Subunit: 45 residues, 4 copies
Amino acid sequence: DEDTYYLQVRGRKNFEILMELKRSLELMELVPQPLVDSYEQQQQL
Amino acid sequence: DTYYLQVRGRKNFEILMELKRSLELMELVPQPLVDSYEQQQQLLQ
Amino acid sequence: DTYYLQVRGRKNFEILMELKRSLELMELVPQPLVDSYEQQQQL
Amino acid sequence: EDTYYLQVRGRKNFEILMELKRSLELMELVPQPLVDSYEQQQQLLQ
């Protein structure tokens, strides 16, 4: 899903946390697939 | 003190909205219940 | 029920712990204040 | 040493935290120029 959505949040500290999570959720698709596969393996084992 | 962000992906948006709500509602939890929570969490370690 | 999670990285842990608290305490906001909050969000 | 344990009440809360655990852990594996590219792209949105 490539649609973009907007939200607002009250509080600078809350904004900063949500921005970190936004960054992580959006950056995750940039991980090379072989490294994702190696991560998944480590996590179940 | 209101901040605006956008995120790509409906599922990402839905996660951030759940967290926006919980973080904003935190301001309305009576303080002694926040203190009680920290004490209770000492029993879970 | 309660569930366990392991996470690598101290900052990551701090973030998840802050979110955990907010998620676990939101049920303790008095209902009249929740009702007021949701009215404001609809606007 | 650098791994931390957390416990959380509620299945839905657990699932939310697990999804974020995964994204936060995986972000360390993004090649740095793609992080830089992401930050540049983000300038077109806000």
